[PDB]
Structure formats: C-alpha cells, structure tokens
Short mmCIF file of C-alpha atoms in Angstrom, two decimals:
data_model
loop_
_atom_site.label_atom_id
_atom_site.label_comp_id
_atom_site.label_asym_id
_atom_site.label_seq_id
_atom_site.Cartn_x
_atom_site.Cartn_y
_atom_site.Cartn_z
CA UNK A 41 -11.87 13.13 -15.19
CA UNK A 42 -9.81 15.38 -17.57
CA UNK A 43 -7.22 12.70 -18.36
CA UNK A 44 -9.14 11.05 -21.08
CA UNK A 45 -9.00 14.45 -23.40
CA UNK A 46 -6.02 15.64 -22.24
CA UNK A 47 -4.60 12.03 -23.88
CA UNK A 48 -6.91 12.38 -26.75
CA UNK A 49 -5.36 16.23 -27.75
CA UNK A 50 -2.00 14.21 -26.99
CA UNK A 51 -2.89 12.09 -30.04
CA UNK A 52 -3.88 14.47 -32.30
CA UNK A 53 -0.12 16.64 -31.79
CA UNK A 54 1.46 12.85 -32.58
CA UNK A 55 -0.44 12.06 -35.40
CA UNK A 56 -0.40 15.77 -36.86
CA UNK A 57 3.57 15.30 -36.81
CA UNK A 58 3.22 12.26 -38.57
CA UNK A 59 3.34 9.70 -36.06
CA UNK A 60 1.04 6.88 -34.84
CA UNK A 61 -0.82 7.22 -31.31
CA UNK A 62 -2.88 4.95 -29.79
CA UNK A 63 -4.71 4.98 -25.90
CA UNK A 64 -3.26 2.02 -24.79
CA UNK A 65 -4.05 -0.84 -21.62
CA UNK A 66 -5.86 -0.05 -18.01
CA UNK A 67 -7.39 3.02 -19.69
CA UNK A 68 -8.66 1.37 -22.43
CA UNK A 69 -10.32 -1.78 -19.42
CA UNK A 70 -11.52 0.73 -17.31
CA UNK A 71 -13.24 2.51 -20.03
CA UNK A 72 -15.43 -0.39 -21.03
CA UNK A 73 -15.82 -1.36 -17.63
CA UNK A 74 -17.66 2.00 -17.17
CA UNK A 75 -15.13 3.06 -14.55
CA UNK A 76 -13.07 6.42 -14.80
CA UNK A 77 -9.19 5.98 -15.82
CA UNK A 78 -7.03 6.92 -12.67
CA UNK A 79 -4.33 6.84 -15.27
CA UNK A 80 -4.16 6.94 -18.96
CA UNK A 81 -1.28 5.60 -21.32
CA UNK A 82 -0.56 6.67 -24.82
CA UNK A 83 1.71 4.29 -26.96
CA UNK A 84 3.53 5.78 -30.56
CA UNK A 85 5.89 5.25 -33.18
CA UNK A 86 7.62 8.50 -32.02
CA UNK A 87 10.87 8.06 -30.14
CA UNK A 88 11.48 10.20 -26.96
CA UNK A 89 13.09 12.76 -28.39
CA UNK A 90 10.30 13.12 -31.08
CA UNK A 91 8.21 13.29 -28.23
CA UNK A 92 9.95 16.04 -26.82
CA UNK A 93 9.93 18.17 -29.68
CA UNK A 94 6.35 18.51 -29.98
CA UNK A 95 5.43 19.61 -26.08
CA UNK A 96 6.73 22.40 -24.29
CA UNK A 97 6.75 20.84 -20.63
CA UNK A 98 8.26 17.23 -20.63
CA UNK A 99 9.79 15.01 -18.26
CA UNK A 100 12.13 12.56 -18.90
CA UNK A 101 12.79 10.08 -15.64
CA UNK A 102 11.85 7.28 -18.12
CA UNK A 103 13.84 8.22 -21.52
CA UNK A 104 15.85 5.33 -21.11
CA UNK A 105 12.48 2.66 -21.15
CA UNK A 106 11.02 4.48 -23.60
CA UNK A 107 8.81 6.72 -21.62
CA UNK A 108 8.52 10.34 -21.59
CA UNK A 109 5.78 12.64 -19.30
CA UNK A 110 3.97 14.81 -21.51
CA UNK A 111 2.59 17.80 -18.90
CA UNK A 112 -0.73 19.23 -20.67
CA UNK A 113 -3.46 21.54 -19.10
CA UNK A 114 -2.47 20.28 -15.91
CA UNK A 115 -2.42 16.50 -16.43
CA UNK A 116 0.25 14.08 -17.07
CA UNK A 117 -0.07 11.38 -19.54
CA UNK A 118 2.81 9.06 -19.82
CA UNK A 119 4.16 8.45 -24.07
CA UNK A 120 5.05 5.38 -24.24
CA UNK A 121 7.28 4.32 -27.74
CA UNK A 122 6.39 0.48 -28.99
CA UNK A 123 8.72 -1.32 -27.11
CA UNK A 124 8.98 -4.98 -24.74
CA UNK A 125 10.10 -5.67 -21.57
CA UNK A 136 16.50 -4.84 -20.96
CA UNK A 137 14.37 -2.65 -23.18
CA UNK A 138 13.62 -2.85 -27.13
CA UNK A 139 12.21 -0.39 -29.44
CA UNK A 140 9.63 -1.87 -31.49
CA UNK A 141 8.23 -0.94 -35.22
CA UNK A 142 4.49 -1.68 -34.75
CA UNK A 143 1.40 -1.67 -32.18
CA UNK A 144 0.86 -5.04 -32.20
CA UNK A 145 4.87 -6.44 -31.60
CA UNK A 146 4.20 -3.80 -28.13
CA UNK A 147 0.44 -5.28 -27.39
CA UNK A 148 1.73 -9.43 -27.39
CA UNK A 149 4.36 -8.51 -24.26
CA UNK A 150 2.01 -7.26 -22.21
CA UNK A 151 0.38 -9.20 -18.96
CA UNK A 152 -3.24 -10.16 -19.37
CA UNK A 153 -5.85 -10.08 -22.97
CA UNK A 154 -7.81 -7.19 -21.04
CA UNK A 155 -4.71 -5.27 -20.97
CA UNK A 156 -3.70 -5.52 -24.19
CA UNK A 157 -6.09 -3.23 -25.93
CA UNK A 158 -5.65 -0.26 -27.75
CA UNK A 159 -8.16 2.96 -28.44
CA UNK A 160 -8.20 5.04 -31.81
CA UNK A 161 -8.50 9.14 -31.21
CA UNK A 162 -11.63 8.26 -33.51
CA UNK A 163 -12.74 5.73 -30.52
CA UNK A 164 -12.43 2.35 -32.60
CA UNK A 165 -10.87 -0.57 -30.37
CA UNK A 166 -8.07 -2.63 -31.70
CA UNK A 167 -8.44 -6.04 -29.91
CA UNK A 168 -5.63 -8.17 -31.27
CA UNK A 169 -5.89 -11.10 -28.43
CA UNK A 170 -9.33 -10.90 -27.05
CA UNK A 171 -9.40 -8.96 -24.39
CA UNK A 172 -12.78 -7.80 -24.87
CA UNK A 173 -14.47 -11.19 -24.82
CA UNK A 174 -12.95 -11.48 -21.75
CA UNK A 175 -13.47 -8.14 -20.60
CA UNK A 176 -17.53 -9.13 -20.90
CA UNK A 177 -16.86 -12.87 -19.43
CA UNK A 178 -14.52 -11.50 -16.51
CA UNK A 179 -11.34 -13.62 -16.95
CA UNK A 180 -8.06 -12.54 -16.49
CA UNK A 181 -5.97 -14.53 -18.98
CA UNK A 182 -2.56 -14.05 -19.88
CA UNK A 183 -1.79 -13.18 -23.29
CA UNK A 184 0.01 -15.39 -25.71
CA UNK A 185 1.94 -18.58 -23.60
CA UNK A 186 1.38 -18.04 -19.76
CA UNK A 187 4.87 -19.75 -19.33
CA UNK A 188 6.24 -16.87 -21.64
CA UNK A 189 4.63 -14.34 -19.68
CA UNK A 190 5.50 -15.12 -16.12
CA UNK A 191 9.31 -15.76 -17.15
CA UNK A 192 9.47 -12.58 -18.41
CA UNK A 193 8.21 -11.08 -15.05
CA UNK A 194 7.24 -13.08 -12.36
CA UNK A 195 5.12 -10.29 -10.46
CA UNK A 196 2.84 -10.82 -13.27
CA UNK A 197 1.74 -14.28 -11.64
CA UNK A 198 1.65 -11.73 -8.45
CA UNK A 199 -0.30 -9.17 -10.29
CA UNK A 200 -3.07 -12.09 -11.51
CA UNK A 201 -3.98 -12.42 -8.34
CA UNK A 202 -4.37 -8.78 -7.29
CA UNK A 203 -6.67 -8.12 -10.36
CA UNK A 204 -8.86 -11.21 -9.58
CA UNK A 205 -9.93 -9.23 -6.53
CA UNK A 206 -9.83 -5.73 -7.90
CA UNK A 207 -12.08 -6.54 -10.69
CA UNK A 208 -13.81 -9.75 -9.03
CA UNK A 209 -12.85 -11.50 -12.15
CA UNK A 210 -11.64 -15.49 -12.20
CA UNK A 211 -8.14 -16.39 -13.43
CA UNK A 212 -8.17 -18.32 -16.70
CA UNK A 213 -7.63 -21.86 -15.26
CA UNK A 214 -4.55 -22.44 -18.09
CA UNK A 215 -2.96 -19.27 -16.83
CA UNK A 216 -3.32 -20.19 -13.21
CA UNK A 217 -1.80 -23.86 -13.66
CA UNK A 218 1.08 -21.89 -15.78
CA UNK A 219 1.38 -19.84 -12.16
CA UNK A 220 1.29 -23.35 -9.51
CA UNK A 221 4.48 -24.66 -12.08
CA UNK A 222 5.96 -20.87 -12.24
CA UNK A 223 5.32 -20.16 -8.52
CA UNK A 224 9.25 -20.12 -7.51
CA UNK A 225 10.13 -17.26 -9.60
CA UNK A 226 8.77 -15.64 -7.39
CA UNK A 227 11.71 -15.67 -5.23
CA UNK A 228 13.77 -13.06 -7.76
CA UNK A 229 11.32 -10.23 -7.58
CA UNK A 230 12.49 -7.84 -5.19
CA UNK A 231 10.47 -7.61 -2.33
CA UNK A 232 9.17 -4.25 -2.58
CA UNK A 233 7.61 -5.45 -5.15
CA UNK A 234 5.92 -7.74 -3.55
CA UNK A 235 5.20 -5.88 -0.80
CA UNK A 236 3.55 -3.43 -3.52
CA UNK A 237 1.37 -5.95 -4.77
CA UNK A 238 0.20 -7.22 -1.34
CA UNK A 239 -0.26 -3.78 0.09
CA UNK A 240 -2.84 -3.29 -3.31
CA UNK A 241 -4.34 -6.69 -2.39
CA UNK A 242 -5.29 -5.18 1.33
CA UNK A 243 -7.49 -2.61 0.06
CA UNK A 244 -8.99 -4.78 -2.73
CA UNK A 245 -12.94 -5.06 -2.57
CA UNK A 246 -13.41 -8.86 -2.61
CA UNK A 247 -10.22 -9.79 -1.26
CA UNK A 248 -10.71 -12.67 -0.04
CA UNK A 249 -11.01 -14.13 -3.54
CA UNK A 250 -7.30 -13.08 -3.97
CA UNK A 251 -6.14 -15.12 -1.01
CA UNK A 252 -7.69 -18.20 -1.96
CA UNK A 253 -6.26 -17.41 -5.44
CA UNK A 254 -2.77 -16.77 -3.43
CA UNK A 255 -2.95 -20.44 -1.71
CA UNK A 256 -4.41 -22.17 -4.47
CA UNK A 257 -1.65 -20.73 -7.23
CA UNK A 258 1.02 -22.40 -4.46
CA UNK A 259 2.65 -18.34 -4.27
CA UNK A 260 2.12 -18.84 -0.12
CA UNK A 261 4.79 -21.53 -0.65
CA UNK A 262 7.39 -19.31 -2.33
CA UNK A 263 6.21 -15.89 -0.98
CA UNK A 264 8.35 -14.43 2.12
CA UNK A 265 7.14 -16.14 4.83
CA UNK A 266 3.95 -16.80 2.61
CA UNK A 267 2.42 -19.32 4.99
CA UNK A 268 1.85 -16.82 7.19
CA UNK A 269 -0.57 -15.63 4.53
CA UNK A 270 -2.87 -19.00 4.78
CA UNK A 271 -5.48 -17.31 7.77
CA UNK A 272 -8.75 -17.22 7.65
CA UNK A 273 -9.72 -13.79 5.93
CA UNK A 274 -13.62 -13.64 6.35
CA UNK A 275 -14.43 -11.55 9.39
CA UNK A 276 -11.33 -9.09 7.19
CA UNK A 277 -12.75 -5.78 5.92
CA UNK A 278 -10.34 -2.74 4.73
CA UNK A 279 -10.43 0.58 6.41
CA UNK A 280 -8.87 1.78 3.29
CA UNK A 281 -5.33 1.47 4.78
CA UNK A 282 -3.27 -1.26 3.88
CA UNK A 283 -1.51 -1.52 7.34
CA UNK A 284 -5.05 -2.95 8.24
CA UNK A 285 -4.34 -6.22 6.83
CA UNK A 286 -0.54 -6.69 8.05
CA UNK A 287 -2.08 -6.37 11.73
CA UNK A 288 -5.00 -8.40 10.86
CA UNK A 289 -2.17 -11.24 9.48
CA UNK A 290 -0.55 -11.07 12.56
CA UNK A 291 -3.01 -10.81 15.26
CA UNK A 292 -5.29 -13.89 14.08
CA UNK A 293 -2.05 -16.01 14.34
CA UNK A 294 -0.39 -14.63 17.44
CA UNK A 295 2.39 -13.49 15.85
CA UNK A 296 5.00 -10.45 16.19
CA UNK A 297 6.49 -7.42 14.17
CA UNK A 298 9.45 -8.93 13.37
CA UNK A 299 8.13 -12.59 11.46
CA UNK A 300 7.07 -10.49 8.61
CA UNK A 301 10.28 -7.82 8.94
CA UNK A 302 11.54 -9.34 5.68
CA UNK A 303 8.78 -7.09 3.72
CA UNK A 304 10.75 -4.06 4.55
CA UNK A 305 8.43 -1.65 6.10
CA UNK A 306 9.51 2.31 7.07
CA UNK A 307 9.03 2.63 10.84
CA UNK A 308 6.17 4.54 10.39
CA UNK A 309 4.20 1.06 9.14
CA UNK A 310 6.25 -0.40 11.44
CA UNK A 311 5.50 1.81 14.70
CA UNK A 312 1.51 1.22 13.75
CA UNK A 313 1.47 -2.23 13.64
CA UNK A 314 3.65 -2.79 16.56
CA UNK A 315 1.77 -0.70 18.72
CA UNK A 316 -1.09 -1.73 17.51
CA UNK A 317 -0.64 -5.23 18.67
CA UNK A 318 0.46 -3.93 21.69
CA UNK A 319 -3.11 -3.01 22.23
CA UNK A 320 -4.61 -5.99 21.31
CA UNK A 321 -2.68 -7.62 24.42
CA UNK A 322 -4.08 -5.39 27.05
CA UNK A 323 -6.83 -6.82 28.65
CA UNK A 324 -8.44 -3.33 29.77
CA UNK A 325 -7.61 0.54 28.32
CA UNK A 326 -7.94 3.11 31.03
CA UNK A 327 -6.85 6.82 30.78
CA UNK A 328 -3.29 5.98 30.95
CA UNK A 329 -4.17 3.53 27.73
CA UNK A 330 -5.49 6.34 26.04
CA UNK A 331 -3.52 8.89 26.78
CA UNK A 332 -0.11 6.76 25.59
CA UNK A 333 -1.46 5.53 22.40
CA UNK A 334 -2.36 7.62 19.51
CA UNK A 335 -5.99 7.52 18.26
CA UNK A 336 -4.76 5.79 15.10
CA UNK A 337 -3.40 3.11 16.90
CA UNK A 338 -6.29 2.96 19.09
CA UNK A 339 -8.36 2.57 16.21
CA UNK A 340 -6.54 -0.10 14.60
CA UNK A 341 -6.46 -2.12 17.76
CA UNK A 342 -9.77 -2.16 18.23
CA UNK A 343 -10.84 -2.36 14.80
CA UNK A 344 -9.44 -6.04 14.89
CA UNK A 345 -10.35 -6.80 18.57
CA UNK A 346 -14.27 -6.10 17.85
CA UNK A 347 -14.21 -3.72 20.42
CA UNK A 348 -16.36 -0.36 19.27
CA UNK A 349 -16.25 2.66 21.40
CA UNK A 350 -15.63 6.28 20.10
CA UNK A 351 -12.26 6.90 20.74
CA UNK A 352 -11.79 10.39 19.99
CA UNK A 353 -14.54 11.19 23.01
CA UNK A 354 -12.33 9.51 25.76
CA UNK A 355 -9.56 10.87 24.58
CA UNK A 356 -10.85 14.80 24.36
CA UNK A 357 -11.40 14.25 28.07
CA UNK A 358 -7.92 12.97 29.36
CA UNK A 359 -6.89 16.53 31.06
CA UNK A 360 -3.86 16.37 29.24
CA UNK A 361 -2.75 15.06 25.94
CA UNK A 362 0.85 15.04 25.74
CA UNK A 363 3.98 15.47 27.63
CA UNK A 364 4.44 18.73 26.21
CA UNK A 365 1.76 20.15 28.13
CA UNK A 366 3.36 19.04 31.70
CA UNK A 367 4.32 21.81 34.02
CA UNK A 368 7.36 20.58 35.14
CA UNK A 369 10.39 19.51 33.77
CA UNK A 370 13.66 17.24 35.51
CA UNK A 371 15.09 20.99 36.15
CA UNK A 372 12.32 21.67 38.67
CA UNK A 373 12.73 18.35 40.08
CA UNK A 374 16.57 19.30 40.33
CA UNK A 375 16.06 22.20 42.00
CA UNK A 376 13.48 21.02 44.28
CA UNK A 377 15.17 17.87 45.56
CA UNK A 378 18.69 19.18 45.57
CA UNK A 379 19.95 16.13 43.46
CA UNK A 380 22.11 16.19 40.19
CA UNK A 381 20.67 14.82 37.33
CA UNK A 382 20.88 11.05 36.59
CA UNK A 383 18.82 8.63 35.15
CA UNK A 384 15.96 8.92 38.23
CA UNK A 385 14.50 11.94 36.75
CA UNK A 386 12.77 9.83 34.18
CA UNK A 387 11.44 7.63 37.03
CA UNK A 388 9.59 10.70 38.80
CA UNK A 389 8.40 12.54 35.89
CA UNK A 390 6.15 9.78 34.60
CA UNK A 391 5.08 9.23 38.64
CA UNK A 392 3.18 12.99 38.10
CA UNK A 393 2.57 12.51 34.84
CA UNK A 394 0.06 9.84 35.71
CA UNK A 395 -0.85 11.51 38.14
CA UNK A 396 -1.94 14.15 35.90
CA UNK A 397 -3.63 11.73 33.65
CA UNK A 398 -5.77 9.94 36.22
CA UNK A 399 -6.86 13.96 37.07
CA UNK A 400 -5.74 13.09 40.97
CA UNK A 401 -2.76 15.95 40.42
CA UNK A 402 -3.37 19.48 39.42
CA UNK A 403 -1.11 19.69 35.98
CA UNK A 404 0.06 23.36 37.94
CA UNK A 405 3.95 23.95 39.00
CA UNK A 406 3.36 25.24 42.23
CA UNK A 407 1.13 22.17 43.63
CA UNK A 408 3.52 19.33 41.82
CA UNK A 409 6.18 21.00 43.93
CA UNK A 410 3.85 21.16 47.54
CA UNK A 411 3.08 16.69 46.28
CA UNK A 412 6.78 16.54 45.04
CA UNK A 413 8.71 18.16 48.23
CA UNK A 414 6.71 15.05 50.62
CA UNK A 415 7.35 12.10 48.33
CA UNK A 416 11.01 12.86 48.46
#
C-alpha cells in the first residue's frame, strides 16, 4: 500500500540528481486495472553506482543486470538502469520498453502521473489481450518462459492471448525444452493458484507447450471439478490423482521433500478405502486435508483428530528400554515390531497410555 510513494519519492531523488525515472511494467497494469501493486519497478538513466550514491541503504545482488534495491521507509523498490535481456545498458526508455514480454507490460508512469504508452498496451489493457510486443517470434527466442508466462497471465488476469502471439507460441513451443525447469515449475506452481485456471490449461494444450513440457501430457486432465486452496501442491495431487498416477512420473519438476512428502502421502490417502483412528492419528491434518479435499470427502478433521488419546509417539510411555528390561532380550530389530503393537493399542483407547499397565499387558504377550 506504501510502495507506490515510496517509488514516487524514489523518483524525485533521481530526477533531482539529474537523472531520468520512470514507474515502469506490472505496477504501471495493475494500477489501471484498479488493483494494488504487490511490487513496484522504477527504470533510469542512472547506472548502479549512481544509484548508490544517492540512498543510504542499498543492496546490490543485481549490480551486475543492472539492478540495485533501494531500501526506503521500510519498502524496497527495485532501480532498474535501461537495459535488454547477456545484459546491455541502454541510452533511452523506449530501447528498454520494446524488450519487454507483453504491450500491457511495457508501460511507463511519469512522477507527474502521465502514461507513456509506446506499443499499446493500454488499448489492450481496456480490451484484455495479452499480446506480445514487437515480433512474437523475437520475443519468445529471446526467452522462451515468456510463451510460458502468456499463459499464466491469461488466467491471472482472465485476459485472451492475441491469436498472432499464440500461433508465434504452437511454432516456438520446443524452446521450451532449454528453460530450466525450475522455471517451469515456477510458472506452473503460479498457474495452480490462478483464479480462472482452467482457461490457462486449455491455453497450455492448445499453444502445443503439453507436447514439449516435462511430461506435459500429463497436464491434458480434465480441470473443471479443480478449485485452489491457495496452495499450489493442490494442483500437483489433483494432476496425479485424476490419472492414477505416482510421485515419481512428475519427479523431473524437482520438488524439496517437503512438496514431495505432501503429495505422496497425500495420495496415499486417497487409496484407503476407510480412515479410522489409526488413519488419523498417522497422517498429519494437512495431509488429511489434501486427501480429502480431492476425494470429495468433507468431514472436520481437526475434531477427530483432538479426540485420538494420543497424538504422537512422543507422548508414549514406554520406550524399547522398558521393553528390554521387561522381556530380558537385547535389542534387535523386534523392538520396532512391539512398540507399534501398544502404540495402537493406545490409539484405538483399548490400552491405558500408563507405564505400569503396558508392562502388566506386555509381561503376558511375551
């Protein structure tokens, strides 16, 4: 909510020193679209080191792409010098604006609030195309996630892809196979949480990216009984449990095994035929969720499992040292075997979870 001023007092420092300063791209959309700017871009004439000079707090990850983080009354906004793309400085706003992605990203904003529209974008801001800007063959060489990216806006915005841009993407679609793949899996995790998503996987079949994507057929379900619960893991485990499918055919995205515990546990849910206490007192209640979020099933979770009488291991009152001493054994592999015998036990509330009764139930069964 601040980030807008905090860029416009940005401006007026640049253009006090002597430089040029413009708002520049998604703020500049989301501004006319009446949304609020979740980030806001500055572009200028001033090199990083200029930029440097004129803020106190500064940081400088990006120096080498022409990027510096100006830190302001608490908000970042990124200074951007004219540049393309294997990164060149540029003299002027508009040699920066013609290398960017799509017409409604190529706008700039005055501090004085006057729009400089170079290619467009605000016609087709108001008739809700995304076009790219310039040659669409041009474009999508110079990136190919940008062919990626086309789709993801279609559904963010609920805008329709310029039909010359999307034939440039159906001839352009095997570039693809150069972007690295967390990239990709960037994109797609963006295109889970989308409102009208399913536009952007007819979009994704129709552009012919499921042909070039990782495993991209896998992509082609059906994605109308599909709404997000805000988490992108959502849709991988919707993916995979309308086509029967495992973990490991989509491994290729490269999730971290905490995406990857969730979804494989998940479907490990969705193959039970009936949860009982020792179903919900395994599985956490996110995975519980999840499973049943895209099984249909609806029953509140978090009751059942406030009422298992215990919740985790952690709270047994035994350990394989009592079972040790009680049985006169030495440890081995067996201990395992017995402590999960009284630990449902516990669960199913047939046991007392006390040390002195597991010992009177563990001295007959041995």
């Amino acid at each position: 909510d601040d980030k807008m001023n905090t860029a416009i007092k940005v401006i007026h420092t640049l253009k006090a020193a002597g430089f040029e300063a413009y708002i520049v791209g998604g703020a500049v959309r989301d501004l006319l679209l009446g949304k609020t700017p979740h980030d806001v871009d500055v572009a200028s004439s001033a090199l990083p080191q200029q930029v440097k000079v004129l803020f106190d707090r500064t940081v400088d990850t990006g120096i080498d792409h022409g990027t510096v983080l100006v830190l302001l009354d608490g908000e970042g906004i990124e200074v951007t010098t004219f540049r393309t793309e294997s990164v060149e400085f540029v003299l002027s706003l508009e040699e920066d604006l013609r290398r960017r992605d799509f017409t409604i990203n190529a706008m700039a904003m005055t501090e004085d609030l006057k729009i400089i529209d170079p290619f467009g974008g605000k016609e087709d801001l108001k008739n809700k195309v995304i076009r790219a800007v310039g040659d669409p063959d041009e474009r999508f060489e110079e990136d190919a996630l940008r062919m990626l990216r086309a789709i993801r806006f279609s559904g963010q915005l609920d805008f329709i892809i310029d039909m010359k841009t999307l034939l440039s993407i159906r001839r352009h679609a095997r570039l693809i196979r150069f972007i690295a793949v967390e990239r990709l899996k960037s994109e797609i995790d963006k295109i889970f949480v989308n409102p009208s998503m399913q536009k952007s996987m007819a979009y994704l079949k129709d552009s012919v990216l499921t042909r070039f994507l990782p495993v991209g057929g896998l992509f082609e379900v059906d994605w109308i009984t599909y709404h997000t619960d805000g988490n992108p893991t959502y849709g991988w485990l919707y993916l995979l449990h309308q086509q029967k499918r495992q973990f490991t055919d989509i491994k290729d995205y490269r999730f971290s095994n905490e995406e990857k515990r969730l979804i494989e546990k998940s479907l490990e849910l969705t193959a039970l035929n009936t949860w009982d206490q020792w179903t919900f007192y395994k599985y956490t209640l996110k995975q519980l969720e999840m499973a049943s979020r895209v099984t249909g099933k609806k029953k509140d979770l978090a009751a059942i499992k406030r009422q298992l009488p215990i919740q985790s291991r952690s709270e047994l009152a035994v350990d394989g040292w009592d079972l040790i001493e009680w049985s006169g054994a030495k440890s081995g592999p067996w201990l395992k075997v017995w402590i999960e015998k009284i630990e449902r036990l516990i669960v199913y509330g047939i046991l007392k979870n006390d040390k002195e009764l597991i010992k009177d139930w563990f001295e007959d069964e041995y």
